[PDB]
Symmetry: C2
């Protein structure tokens, strides 16, 4: 049986007891695969309207991904699963910020 | 008195036996200041020679920042302090490795 390995753009659920919430992977498939780690930003239903928030437009519900919050996590050990995939738009809005906080 | 506020490029000591180690701060002063949180990557004296390692060259000794491991931590609460500042090239090399990891 072949475990799910997050790919760039995937929205995943994982634990941070019940500490598990959603996030989205900014780290390319290979990296995620070899290291059992990935770069991602956390998402939540609650929107307080921070500058670095990126709205995610969903079918049924809707939520926000916090782009200032990028963090390295170990998805493998942490039981990360696939809740969906963000539109290339959302993906890029995300990065564009993260570049803002950091950039080239 | 007014707490030190980590700035872009600063090397800080934090709490994550190795000291719950230092990190290099990739966030600008403002964000760090207003938010009470920052983006940084962890540093270690150990090195495995991995693709995302970045050497930080010290006077007495040398170390490495791990560029793939960047994270948001809450420094005010977690009690960050300033251990020094990375070289312009060092900080730059870090950022590149990051966007190398992310388009
Ligand atoms: Na004090």
């Amino acid at each position: 049986v072949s475990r799910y390995v997050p790919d760039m753009g995937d929205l995943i659920w994982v634990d941070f007891q019940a500490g598990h919430r959603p996030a989205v992977v900014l780290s390319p498939f290979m990296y995620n695969n070899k290291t059992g780690m990935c770069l991602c930003v956390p998402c939540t239903t609650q929107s307080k309207g921070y500058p670095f928030e990126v709205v995610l437009s969903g079918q049924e519900r809707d939520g926000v991904a916090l782009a200032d919050q990028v963090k390295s996590i170990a998805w493998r050990a942490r039981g990360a699963t696939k809740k969906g995939t963000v539109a290339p738009e959302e993906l890029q809005l995300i990065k564009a910020k993260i570049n803002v906080l950091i950039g080239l």
